[PDB]
Amino acid sequence: MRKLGLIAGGGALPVELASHCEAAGRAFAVMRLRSFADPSLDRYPGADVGIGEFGKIFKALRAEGCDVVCFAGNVSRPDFSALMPDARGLKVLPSLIVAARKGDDALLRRVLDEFEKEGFEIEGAHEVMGEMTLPRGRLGKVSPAPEHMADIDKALDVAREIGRLDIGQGAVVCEGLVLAVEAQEGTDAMLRRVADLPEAIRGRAERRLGVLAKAPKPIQETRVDLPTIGVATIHRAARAGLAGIVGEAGRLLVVDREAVIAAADDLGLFVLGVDPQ
Amino acid sequence: MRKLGLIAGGGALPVELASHCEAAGRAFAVMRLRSFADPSLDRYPGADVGIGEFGKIFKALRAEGCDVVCFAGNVSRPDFSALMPDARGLKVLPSLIVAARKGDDALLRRVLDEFEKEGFEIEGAHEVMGEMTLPRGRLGKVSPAPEHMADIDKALDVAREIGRLDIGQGAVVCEGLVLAVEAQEGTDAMLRRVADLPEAIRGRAERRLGVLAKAPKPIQETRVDLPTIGVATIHRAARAGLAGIVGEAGRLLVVDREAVIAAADDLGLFVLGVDPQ
Numbered sequence: 001m002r003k004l005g006l007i008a009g010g011g012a013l014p015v016e017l018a019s020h021c022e023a024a025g026r027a028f029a030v031m032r033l034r035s036f037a038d039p040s041l042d043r044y045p046g047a048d049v050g051i052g053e054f055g056k057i058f059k060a061l062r063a064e065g066c067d068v069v070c071f072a073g074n075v076s077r078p079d080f081s082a083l084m085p086d087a088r089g090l091k092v093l094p095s096l097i098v099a100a101r102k103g104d105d106a107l108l109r110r111v112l113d114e115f116e117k118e119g120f121e122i123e124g125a126h127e128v129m130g131e132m133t134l135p136r137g138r139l140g141k142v143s144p145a146p147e148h149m150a151d152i153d154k155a156l157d158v159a160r161e162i163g164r165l166d167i168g169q170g171a172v173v174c175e176g177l178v179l180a181v182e183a184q185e186g187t188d189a190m191l192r193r194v195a196d197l198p199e200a201i202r203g204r205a206e207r208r209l210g211v212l213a214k215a216p217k218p219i220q221e222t223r224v225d226l227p228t229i230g231v232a233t234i235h236r237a238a239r240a241g242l243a244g245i246v247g248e249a250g251r252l253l254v255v256d257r258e259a260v261i262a263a264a265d266d267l268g269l270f271v272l273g274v275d276p277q
Numbered sequence: 278m279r280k281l282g283l284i285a286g287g288g289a290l291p292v293e294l295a296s297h298c299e300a301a302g303r304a305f306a307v308m309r310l311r312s313f314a315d316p317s318l319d320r321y322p323g324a325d326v327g328i329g330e331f332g333k334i335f336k337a338l339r340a341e342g343c344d345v346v347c348f349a350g351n352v353s354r355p356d357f358s359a360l361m362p363d364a365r366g367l368k369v370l371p372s373l374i375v376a377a378r379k380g381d382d383a384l385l386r387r388v389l390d391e392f393e394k395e396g397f398e399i400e401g402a403h404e405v406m407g408e409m410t411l412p413r414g415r416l417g418k419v420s421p422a423p424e425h426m427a428d429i430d431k432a433l434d435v436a437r438e439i440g441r442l443d444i445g446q447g448a449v450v451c452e453g454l455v456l457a458v459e460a461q462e463g464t465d466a467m468l469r470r471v472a473d474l475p476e477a478i479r480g481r482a483e484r485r486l487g488v489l490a491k492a493p494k495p496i497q498e499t500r501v502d503l504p505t506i507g508v509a510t511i512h513r514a515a516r517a518g519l520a521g522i523v524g525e526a527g528r529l530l531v532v533d534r535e536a537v538i539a540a541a542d543d544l545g546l547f548v549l550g551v552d553p554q
């Protein structure tokens with residue numbers, strides 16, 4: 001996982017991105033564009049730079065060891081007279097004004113040419129999310145078996161009806177039997193209480209049965225964060241003799257992706273991203 | 278609690294009654310009327326008597342130390358020639374034939390006069406249930422406070438929506454916060470996991486908050502038993518700093534009523550029966 005240089009313009013997108021990055025445990029820093037970046041970003045490591053202190057931005061970008069950057073947020077073309085660039089900066093400035101004369105698009109494009117020529121890999125907001133969340137389909141080497149399809153389907157739309165009822169975000173289904181429903185206790189606790197059920201209605205570590213599904217509750221006016229998967233999640237779900245874990249393909253954060261994949265792989269669990277709706 | 282002499286005619290009523298009696302831990306015996314009583318009653322302590330081996334029935338009734346009887350099930354008037362009474366029996370027989378000449382009602386009534394004159398307290402099926410289940414309103418000395426009304430209302434219709442979803446039969450609500458939802462793990466386990474939540478979102482043993490509601494799932498073609506309340510239920514709900522417990526007034530079995538009342542009373546919990554629907 002490349003460390004991210006989040007270049008933050010105005011609005012709520014970079015803010016969401018930062019939080020999700022920190023939840024996923026992904027490494028980053030924030031380049032907060034003066035007068036654009038929302039102040040609730042000052043809490044993250046990084047730097048407050050004006051446009052176009054390009055010299056400064058490359059400086060801090062390398063200073064944080066970012067090799068990939070994402071540009072997220074509202075930015076409008078500036079005043080080119082009132083601009084107070086550093087000397088890098090002033091070097092780039094005319095190239096900008098030419099492109100600017102051709103339109104915002106050519107201008108934005110020109111800015112990116114510079115970061116590429118400098119040179120950092122450029123990523124879009126969607127791809128940043130994509131790489132931290134579930135994929136579509138298996139995450140590790142283990143796939144589900146036809147036996148598990150049954151539970152996978154009902155694990156989810158149960159876990160969704162829980163969410164619709166503003167309760168918890170998780171549910172464990174084994175052979176059609178809802179064994180466990182999350183609400184307020186955390187997923188670890190639930191997976192423990194499941195390991196504790198009679199092996200009769202349960203899966204076995206030898207022969208595994210049953211599926212953990214964890215799905216996000218529907219959006220709100222209040223900001224909404226995504227459900228998460230830990231390495232300890234893989235641990236306890238294995239100890240419950242569960243066959244695998246599942247969630248909506250974009251809508252679930254994986255904390256330490258590498259580590260999670262290795263637990264699931266070593267223990268025989270599948271982890272599955274599922275097409276939303 | 279008077280020990281019950283369940284006098285079992287045909288059909289599924291006495292069967293249900295026996296099971297509920299045994300779930301409530303209430304003392305009983307079954308007088309299984311030959312050719313009437315369903316054979317799944319042979320498992321319970323008691324006796325197989327024909328009508329009208331009255332001598333036998335009084336004998337075994339006392340032999341089980343029953344001082345109250347309930348007549349439950351289908352019975353039709355018999356053949357009075359083909360009847361093989363014992364000598365008690367034959368003594369009573371004519372009194373019966375007189376009443377029988379006035380109608381089934383007078384006949385049934387006459388039978389009851391005999392058990393009363395013998396003499397056992399006669400109870401109806403409904404009253405038998407009533408005395409084992411919740412009442413309507415408080416069960417013990419403790420009442421709910423106005424503060425608790427909030428949770429009481431939502432504890433229940435949550436616990437009902439769980440039941441509608443064929444999951445578990447219980448739910449714990451505190452200050453509007455669903456803390457816990459039962460499914461497959463038993464109520465004891467849930468009440469433990471609740472005692473384990475942060476005291477921040479929880480009630481305190483000093484100042485109590487929150488309510489356990491446990492409600493029956495909707496009827497089925499398959500026979501349906503009632504949710505139950507234990508003394509350990511009172512224990513753990515107290516240890517979770519809950520203010521009280523609640524259920525539908527007829528629709529919840531109390532196991533060791535005396536003992537439960539004394540736990541709730543000594544610990545400061547209310548236990549509340551609520552009008553169904």
Ligand SMILES: CCCCCCCCCCC[C@@H](O)CC(=O)N[C@H]1[C@@H](OP(=O)(O)O)O[C@H](CO)[C@@H](O)[C@@H]1OC(=O)C[C@H](O)CCCCCCCCCCC
Pocket residue numbers: 009049050051052053054057071072073074075076077078096104105107108111
């Ligand atoms: C110190 C050095 C700092 C260097 C400054 C770098 C700032 C670059 C500008 C970043 C804007 C970028 O975050 C916006 C963006 O990408 N959005 C694309 C997206 O559409 P949205 O609906 O707006 O989400 O998806 C679309 C595709 O589906 C796509 O087309 C949208 O692109 C735009 O939003 C267009 C821009 O909003 C137009 C503004 C151009 C940049 C103006 C300022 C240029 C920098 C000044 C340099 C001196």
Ligand SMILES: CCCCCCCCCCC[C@@H](O)CC(=O)N[C@H]1[C@@H](OP(=O)(O)O)O[C@H](CO)[C@@H](O)[C@@H]1OC(=O)C[C@H](O)CCCCCCCCCCC
Pocket residue numbers: 286326327328329330331334348349350351352353354355373381382384385388
């Ligand atoms: C060894 C000694 C054994 C002695 C034998 C004792 C057997 C007594 C008969 C028991 C019948 C009783 O269980 C039924 C009953 O109570 N039901 C009442 C109830 O209505 P349901 O809709 O039927 O539930 O609620 C109604 C009120 O809302 C009420 O009216 C219904 O009463 C009846 O069901 C009427 C009976 O079904 C009619 C039958 C009379 C008894 C016939 C056999 C008499 C015993 C033979 C003695 C030799």
Ligand SMILES: [Mg+2]
Pocket residue numbers: 070071123124125
């Ligand atoms: Mg982009």
Ligand SMILES: [Mg+2]
Pocket residue numbers: 347348400401402
């Ligand atoms: Mg009666």
